[PDB]
Amino acid sequence: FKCYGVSPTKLNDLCFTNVYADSFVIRGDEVRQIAPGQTGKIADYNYKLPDDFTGCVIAWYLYRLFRKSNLKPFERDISTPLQSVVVLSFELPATVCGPKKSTNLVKNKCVNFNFNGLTGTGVLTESNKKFLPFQQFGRDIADTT
Amino acid sequence: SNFGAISSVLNDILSRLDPPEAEVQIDRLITGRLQSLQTYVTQQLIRAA
């Protein structure tokens, strides 16, 4: 169990917008090659993780022998040569978010707020900025929320 | 600017990482922002001259 981009403690406090999950048979001794930036017969011809991976590798029967090139990150190949463990991936609308009990709004005070996984400190008011039906937040001239 | 870290927002690093792994990201952000401040102060001195 090794969460690369995030911490396993912090997994219960965030919103991830999508969660994928992968499943395959490995021998149990080739679980080294499911890390970012690896080589081997699995990490070159079968299943290639990118060099910037956000997720967790959870591990508790034909495999390919030859291919003319190395793969792209998250590439499949069902062509016909070939002769004879969960990978979660995140991306940082919540929609797959976590188990926190909310507490109702408080205006006109410096408060600690957590809106779908973004933290801060400030005073909440009612805004004149009319939006459209496609927004989650807004920004400014200097690129801050 | 991320300066080679995972994010340009400090609260996102502090909410996504444990502290002994957040250290090496906060160090990169501190180094880049010190470089920016020192460049600004040097050019302000030369412009006031």
UniProtKB/Swiss-Prot annotation, chain B:
It comes from the Viruses. Changing L14F: In strain: Omicron/BA.1. Subunit of the fusion protein that is processed upon entry into the host cell. Mediates fusion of the virion and cellular membranes by functioning as a class I viral fusion protein. Contains a viral fusion peptide that is unmasked after S2 cleavage. This cleavage can occur at the cell membrane by host TMPRSS2 or during endocytosis by host CSTL. In either case, this triggers an extensive and irreversible conformational change that leads to fusion of the viral envelope with the cellular cytoplasmic membrane, releasing viral genomic RNA into the host cell cytoplasm. This is Spike protein S2'. The chain holds residues 968 to 1016 of 1273 of the full protein.
